[PDB]
Ligand binder design. Sequence first.
Ligand code: SF4
Ligand code: SF4
Lengths: 71, 150
Amino acid sequence: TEAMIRNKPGMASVKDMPLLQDGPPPGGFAPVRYARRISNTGPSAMAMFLAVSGAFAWGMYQVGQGNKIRR
Amino acid sequence: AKKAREGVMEFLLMNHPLDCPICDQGGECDLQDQSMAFGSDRGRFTEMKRSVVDKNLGPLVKTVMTRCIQCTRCVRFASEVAGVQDLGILGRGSGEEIGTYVEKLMTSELSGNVIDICPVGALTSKPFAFKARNWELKATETIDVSDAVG
Ligand code: SF4
Ligand code: SF4
């Protein structure tokens, strides 16, 4: 058998049997990423302290002015 | 020697029907255990196997002569040990058919042992029609008490 299970009309020979099974497409798949691409594009060490310090510098002045208005 | 054995076990399994699942002697088979041990793993015969009608050999020996390989063991057992001379190898070639040429129940006692003689399911106990399998049966080496031969 095995030439009556995989017919492929013609083929003249036991080789050239159909042989259609699963696999990667011709040319493989896309290059798959595996590294750790963690983007560190956030606020830096400064700009976070200076936003906090800047908020403290101006916002506490605003607390003071609000205390003046309340008084 | 091994190539000769594989050759012959291919011929035997060539015109032999795929009756192993429905064969009563499926597990306890010389043909199955010689093919799975000395015969080739594959068969190149992809054509029309020969088939043979089932002879009526009585209420003891269920007969499926298509499975039978025409090794002649039973036709010798009935002629010699059983001594009744009813079985025969009728015909020649692949058309060879083992059994009585006229419908003739094996009137001889001692002719139920042809099933153990038979290396193939073909001749099987009709009482033990299909009720069990060669692996389920737990065997005890008992004796017999029907007749005083023990
Ligand atoms: S005798 Fe029965 S079990 Fe053994 S190979 Fe033939 S069909 Fe299969
Ligand atoms: S013993 Fe069984 S296999 Fe051998 S010739 Fe007789 S019926 Fe056929």
